[PDB]
């Protein structure tokens, strides 16, 4: 809306930051599913039969 072009940097900056949050969010669930994590992983581990 603003004749200024710099404004573009903002719109792009917003997404650039949101992307970082995606990496942190993964941790939020990691905690809630801290136990289930191993429960499921166990299936993948034994499946290999190392």
From Swiss-Prot:
Transmembrane segments: 10-30
Role played: Cooperates with LY96 to mediate the innate immune response to bacterial lipoproteins and other microbial cell wall components. Cooperates with TLR1 or TLR6 to mediate the innate immune response to bacterial lipoproteins or lipopeptides. Acts via MYD88 and TRAF6, leading to NF-kappa-B activation, cytokine secretion and the inflammatory response. May also activate immune cells and promote apoptosis in response to the lipid moiety of lipoproteins.
Lineage: Eukaryota, Metazoa, Chordata, Craniata, Vertebrata
Subcellular location: Membrane; Cytoplasmic vesicle, Phagosome membrane; Membrane raft
Species this chain originates from: Homo sapiens (Human)
Protein name per the record: Toll-like receptor 2
Description of what induces expression: (Microbial infection) In macrophages, induced by SARS-CoV-2 infection.
Subunit structure: Interacts with LY96, TLR1 and TLR6 (via extracellular domain). TLR2 seems to exist in heterodimers with either TLR1 or TLR6 before stimulation by the ligand. The heterodimers form bigger oligomers in response to their corresponding ligands as well as further heterotypic associations with other receptors such as CD14 and/or CD36. Binds MYD88 (via TIR domain). Interacts with TICAM1. Interacts with CNPY3. Interacts with ATG16L1. Interacts with PPP1R11. Interacts with TICAM2. Interacts with TIRAP. (Microbial infection) Interacts with M.tuberculosis EsxA.
Family according to the record: Belongs to the Toll-like receptor family.
Record gene name: TLR2
Tissue specificity: Highly expressed in peripheral blood leukocytes, in particular in monocytes, in bone marrow, lymph node and in spleen. Also detected in lung and in fetal liver. Levels are low in other tissues.
